[model samples]
Target: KVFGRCELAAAMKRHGLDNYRGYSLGNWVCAAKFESNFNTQATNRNTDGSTDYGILQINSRWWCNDGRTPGSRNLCNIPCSALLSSDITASVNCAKKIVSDGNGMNAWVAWRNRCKGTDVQAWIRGCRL
Candidate 1:
């Protein structure tokens, strides 16, 4: 379901990402595969009606703070929500920052070693953010 390459490149440029070599785009895809099978229009509600939405299944109320209203607008301001806007690079760049400050790609080596065969969360924890 990956879209246009040029568009992805443009989105990366807008987010100040020089390239996608070592960011969390692949990690996100892996997470989505495990979490919701990469379905962008997906939704799942808790018993109280709070829910996860879109690709990467971002929890709208928790992460995004654009302040329009819950579920009333696209949560593109949140970390992973940028993916919904076809801005995968922005999402990955934010994730990189959280995981490694400004040294994300360079720091990932240690993280990869620590999390060797584990899940995404384990790898992220090893990133030493």
Candidate 2:
């Protein structure tokens, strides 16, 4: 499912993304925009044979177990397939683990390229959060 910007922003805020490890809601929103455009089923095959999954694009190499990524750590202790669900519960939880693991929001390359050091407030503009 695709989510409107504010809709996704609000949803993520509900999951405690706002001010999560010093990253604001806008940061998460902007990252999601570049990562998956808020598409719940988004997936990307990486050059290293790892895969990115869900809106936040949790990676299979280190975050989830897909039984395919080489040297998979599966640190999130979740199946990579769980990230593709519309519910987003597992995705959010896994993302929390990623950020909390000292990666912060920079764990997502899209966030670094697009969301970081930018006027991310626009990503959540007018969202009543």
Candidate 3:
């Protein structure tokens, strides 16, 4: 399922992404905006033979196990397929782990190139959450 701006905002907030590990709701919102356009089932294959899965684009190489990735650490201990569902609970939880593991929100290059150091407040301004 793809989410509207406010819907994504509220969802992330509900999932404990608001100010999670010092990253604000807007940062999460903006990252999702660029990473997957808020679509739950998005995927991108990396040049390293690893694939990015779901809305946050968690990498198969380190975070989730897709089996296709030969050296996966599966740090999140989750099946990559779980990230594709609209449920999002697994994705949110994995994102928290990714951040706490020291990658922070910069785990997604899209966040660094687009959301980082920007006024992401606009991304959540109209959200009721």
Candidate 4:
């Protein structure tokens, strides 16, 4: 349950997201459900691709390459494989910076609030790295 493609997708669906890319699948899922579901492919439209953008869902579109693009590739400015090669923390941090410019832990806190009443802790424990 370490946030694989399918599990992540399920989580994303719960969050209201649909068109999740590699970066969203990994970073957003981790930020949103790390304390609840760890579904790497989780989706949600709460902030969608406009308001709270990027993987960690950091607000402020300016940091995410104008926020008019689709995949996290454009926002992150990196290839999928290269992004995946980094550790989860690195990936999460990278995403956070892209949107908030290193001042958006609020996104993470919000995600925690959304997941606190659920099995988020259990999910994190089950996940592998």
Candidate 5:
């Protein structure tokens, strides 16, 4: 039960993710909305039996293991449950690790499907941050 877009924006901004890689806070806001509606406990099971975790929908195949999978790289060195915390510091760190490879936010399918190249004004306007 996270507070929603505005609060998430403020948290990420105060945590120093305002405009990394030329993307604005609204960019992330839009992406997160499409990803998980800012919910920390969000999960999506893929057809491959891997699950996406947390607000960013990080895949267990590459990011963290949700314990249902065995071949996870666990690149963030944390369990998938760590990303499910309301405090998203761990999730953000793993997101940074994902995009640091130069993929940017394209690591998220939801972002590509919904947020990419689209106007993000709605995600930012009146955001009580």
Candidate 6:
């Protein structure tokens, strides 16, 4: 598994994602930390037989194909495993697609439950970027 690093803040900033696409940078960082602790290879199997992929936990039931899940909506048109890359390009793109659906980062359970209306500044703490 690839663990997230502080430099990811700078990288995200460089990618023009520090504050973009409809949510705060702190929110995105907080959500990712809670969802996957910044691990790119993270995957979680839900009791409903669905799976969450990558840092933002994009759901296999709606966003990506896990191959094992036959009915995945695959809105992102990428293999679920592809979202687990350390590069984060595919996951970042998919996250934007999710936000475009009008839910923003709230599409992520972690974001809804842990990040919203909270002190997410700690998420970027120490990064100083």
TM-score of each: 0.39, 0.95, 0.97, 0.34, 0.92, 0.89
Best-to-worst TM-score order: 3, 2, 5, 6, 1, 4
Which residue segments of model 1 deviate by more than 4 Å? 1-26, 65-129
lDDT of 1 at 16: 51
- lDDT, ranked from best to worst: 3, 2, 5, 6, 1, 4
Worst 10 residues of 2 by lDDT: 67-76
Instruction: Give all candidate RMSDs, comma-separated.
Output: 9.5, 1.0, 0.8, 10.4, 1.4, 1.7
Candidate 2: global Cα-lDDT?
0.89
Model 5 lDDT vs. the true structure? Answer: 0.83
Off by over 4 Å in 3: none
Tens digit of per-residue lDDT, candidate 6, span 1-129: 555556666666666667687566777778788899988888899887999988878898899988887766889999898988878888888887788887777778878888898887777787867
Error of 5 at 13 (Å): 0.6
RMSD of 3: 0.8
Question: Which 10 successive residues of model 5 have the least lDDT summed?
Answer: 14-23
Q: List the global CA lDDT of all models.
A: 0.43, 0.89, 0.92, 0.41, 0.83, 0.80
* Top-lDDT candidate index: 3
Best by TM-score: 3
CA shift of 6, model 5, Å: 0.9
Q: Per-residue lDDT of 1-129 in model 4, one digit per residue for the tens? A: 245544554545554343233233334454554433443223333355543432343333333343353554344554333323213443454554444544433336655465434443343344443
User: Candidate 1 on 11-82: residue-level lDDT in tens?
Assistant: 434555443445543343334444445444455654544555454444445444334335643334663344
Pairs with steric clashes in candidate 6: none
